[PDB]
Design an enzyme around this catalytic site. Structure first.
Site, PDB file in Angstrom:
ATOM      1  CD  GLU A  96     -28.775  63.228  18.877  1.00 35.21           C
ATOM      2  OE1 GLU A  96     -29.162  64.097  18.072  1.00 35.21           O
ATOM      3  OE2 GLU A  96     -29.547  62.789  19.776  1.00 35.21           O
ATOM      4  CE1 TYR A  97     -28.798  56.245  21.891  1.00 36.68           C
ATOM      5  CE2 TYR A  97     -26.804  54.994  22.385  1.00 36.68           C
ATOM      6  CZ  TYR A  97     -28.006  55.133  21.704  1.00 36.68           C
ATOM      7  OH  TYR A  97     -28.417  54.192  20.774  1.00 36.68           O
ATOM      8  CD  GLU A 123     -30.844  60.368  21.391  1.00 36.35           C
ATOM      9  OE1 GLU A 123     -29.784  60.535  20.775  1.00 36.35           O
ATOM     10  OE2 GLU A 123     -31.307  59.221  21.596  1.00 36.35           O
ATOM     11  CD  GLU A 126     -31.924  54.756  24.989  1.00 38.24           C
ATOM     12  OE1 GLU A 126     -31.131  54.807  25.950  1.00 38.24           O
ATOM     13  OE2 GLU A 126     -31.879  55.581  24.030  1.00 38.24           O
ATOM     14  CB  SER A 170     -29.729  52.514  23.629  1.00 33.18           C
ATOM     15  OG  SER A 170     -29.278  51.499  22.745  1.00 33.18           O
ATOM     16  NE  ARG A 171     -28.502  47.806  22.156  1.00 34.91           N
ATOM     17  CZ  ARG A 171     -28.154  48.519  21.088  1.00 34.91           C
ATOM     18  NH1 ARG A 171     -29.048  49.320  20.504  1.00 34.91           N
ATOM     19  NH2 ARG A 171     -26.923  48.423  20.597  1.00 34.91           N
TER      20      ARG A 171
END
Length: 292
Positions: A96-97, A123, A126, A170-171
């Site tokens: 997972e990131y 992963e 997003e 993720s943003r």
């Protein structure tokens, strides 16, 4: 082990917090069960037996030849170590990131993966969000003049989850995916420990010099929220459809991981994703350097 060819990949889930528990739940989904089977799970907590499989030690997970794949779902600060160990042990790895909290470390892991001939997949659900697909369709053919993306949420322990540019990567991934590779212009970090408050503000530029402001805000009194405001030479965009979390979004990510396992993702696509992943981790690393 048996020499008759097998139908599935054996999976071990490492770390079972909210993400690991979702991966375990998703392994029970039908079509995903056509290609994968849970072998065991590793946890810092004494769970003992989940979904009928016994909890196993990290040593045991690493040595087991019944396990072809490791899902790294532990706290981010341990991602790097776990990925290294499993790739060293010959396992394909889904993590997972963020895959690491260090750019140079991520470089090393990508090199290790290539050397071991293993899939390493970070992963990023997003990019599978319905509103992200909406945004991708909306910015098409438009030229970004200036934009901002702000995410507000509750405090996050940096020791376990990383500096905000990494924990909130993720943003940044949204921005890079939407507008291309970005130029880091500046970054500032305000912290009020007494109030458990943090605000990171990053100024970035698209290749054509459109200005982007990325803000990660964390405080005990903040509602979890995302604020989008994209101004184009031809109109603006401040509203995105109101969508609830999709219970199957991780399965969509798993489908991609399985295509990689089956050698079904082009070299082109594999290289572009790694280039984007590394571009984002490099920005996060530099942002952290600029915030001092």
């Amino acid at each position: 082990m048996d020499a008759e060819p097998k139908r599935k990949f054996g999976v071990v889930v490492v770390g079972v917090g909210r993400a690991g528990s979702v991966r375990l739940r998703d392994l029970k989904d039908p079509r995903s069960a056509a290609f994968l089977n849970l072998i065991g799970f590793v946890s810092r907590r004494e769970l003992g037996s989940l979904d009928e499989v016994r909890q196993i030690s990290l040593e045991d997970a690493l040595r087991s030849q019944e396990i072809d794949v490791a899902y790294i779902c532990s706290e981010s600060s341990s991602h790097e170590d776990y990925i290294r160990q499993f790739l060293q042990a010959g396992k394909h790895v889904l993590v997972e990131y963020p895959m690491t909290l260090s750019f140079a470390a991520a470089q090393e892991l990508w090199e290790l993966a290539a050397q071991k001939g293993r899939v390493l997949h970070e992963e990023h659900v997003e990019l599978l969000m319905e509103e992200f697909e909406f945004l991708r369709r909306e910015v098409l053919g438009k030229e970004l003049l200036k934009g901002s993306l702000r995410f507000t949420a509750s405090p996050l322990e940096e020791e376990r989850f990383g500096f905000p540019a990494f924990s909130g990567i993720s943003r940044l991934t949204w921005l890079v995916s939407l507008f291309g590779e970005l130029s880091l212009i500046s970054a500032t970090l305000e912290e009020r420990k007494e109030d458990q408050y943090m605000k990171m503000t990053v100024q970035l530029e698209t290749q054509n010099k459109g200005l982007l402001s990325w803000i990660e805000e964390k405080g005990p009194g903040l509602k979890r929220n995302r604020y989008v405001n994209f101004q184009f030479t031809s109109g603006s965009l401040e509203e995105v459809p109101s969508v609830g979390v999709n219970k199957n979004i991780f399965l969509k990510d798993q489908d991609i991981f399985v295509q990689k396992l089956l050698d079904q993702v082009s070299a082109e696509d594999l290289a572009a994703e790694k280039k984007r992943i590394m571009h984002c981790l490099g920005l996060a690393s530099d942002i952290q350097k600029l915030c001092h």
